[PDB]
Amino acid sequence: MEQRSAETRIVEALLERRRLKDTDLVRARQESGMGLLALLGRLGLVSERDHAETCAEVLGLPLVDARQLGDTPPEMEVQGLSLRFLKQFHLCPVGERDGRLDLWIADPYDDYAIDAVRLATGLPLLLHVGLRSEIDDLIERWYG
Numbered sequence: 075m076e077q078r079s080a081e082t083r084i085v086e087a088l089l090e091r092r093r094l095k096d097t098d099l100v101r102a103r104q105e106s107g108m109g110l111l112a113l114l115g116r117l118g119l120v121s122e123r124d125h126a127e128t129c130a131e132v133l134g135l136p137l138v139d140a141r142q143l144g145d146t147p148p149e150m151e152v153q154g155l156s157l158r159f160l161k162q163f164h165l166c167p168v169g170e171r172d173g174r175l176d177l178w179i180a181d182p183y184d185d186y187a188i189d190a191v192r193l194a195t196g197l198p199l200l201l202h203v204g205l206r207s208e209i210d211d212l213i214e215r216w217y218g
């Protein structure tokens with residue numbers, strides 16, 4: 075159906091909301107490997123909060139914060155996700171309710187990562203956007 079990419083719509087919304095300066099965006103254009111929004115985050119040009127916010131607006135997804143998560147994992151399995159994978163992709167299973175896996179995710183526009191999670195777990199997902207470092211903190215607190 076194919077109108078514009080989720081990343082493109084997020085970048086456009088960052089500009090329009092003035093969470094990103096057009097001068098900064100023009101300077102950003104690879105090469106660590108690095109997606110555009112990744113590079114903006116790494117150059118210090120978009121805050122984690124405004125990244126999360128905008129991802130949530132564009133994709134219509136709920137936002138979840140660190141107040142909402144307890145000190146140890148809730149219960150449930152969950153297969154196919156190594157601790158390393160969680161850390162690399164910055165996402166974290168946080169619960170299972172009505173036959174769906176609640177997944178806290180930094181980069182909900184990344185269809186490669188999501189399709190990886192869908193295939194590895196074999197579970198239907200419910201995506202919740204979280205600030206990158208908050209997800210990282212929970213992964214470590216809950217594991218390693």
Ligand SMILES: C[As](C)(=O)[O-]
Nearest residue numbers: 149150167168169
């Ligand atoms: C470890 As889980 C599926 O119960 O957040």
